[PDB]
Amino acid sequence: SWIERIKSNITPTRKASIPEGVWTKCDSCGQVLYRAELERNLEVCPKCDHHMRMTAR
């Protein structure tokens, strides 16, 4: 009866690769962010609107 299952675990061998420089973090709130989104919102975490560093240029 599928209504009562075993609650099996996931297989570790499965492995997918995400590019390194496409996901950033905001330590102010902890919400992971999409680097291009943050960089397009003038380095402003859209979650908590916490300003961050920006390059002079």
């Binding site: 570790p12 499965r14 996901w23």
Partner: protein, 77 residues
């Protein structure tokens, strides 16, 4: 006792680097402020800090084994 659970989803790593000592290990107790594991997600190797000071009774996961939200990680008695 208490069980601390991963608050996000991602690969489970205990050693911060490919060849590194584990942040914690069975036996040695931890305190409120200390990193217990690494939950990688999108190459951003995050860290987990306990909330109740006590002995590390056991570790319910293994390095390289993906974990889900609220997935129990370690039980503190």
């Amino acid at each position: 006792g208490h069980i601390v659970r991963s608050p996000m989803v991602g690969t489970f790593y205990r050693t911060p680097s490919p060849d590194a000592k584990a942040f914690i290990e069975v036996g040695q107790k931890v305190n409120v402020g200390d990193t217990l594991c690494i939950v990688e997600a999108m190459k951003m190797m995050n860290q987990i800090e306990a909330d109740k000071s006590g002995t590390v009774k056991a570790i319910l996961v293994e390095s390289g084994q993906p974990v889900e939200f609220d997935e129990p990680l370690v039980v503190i008695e």
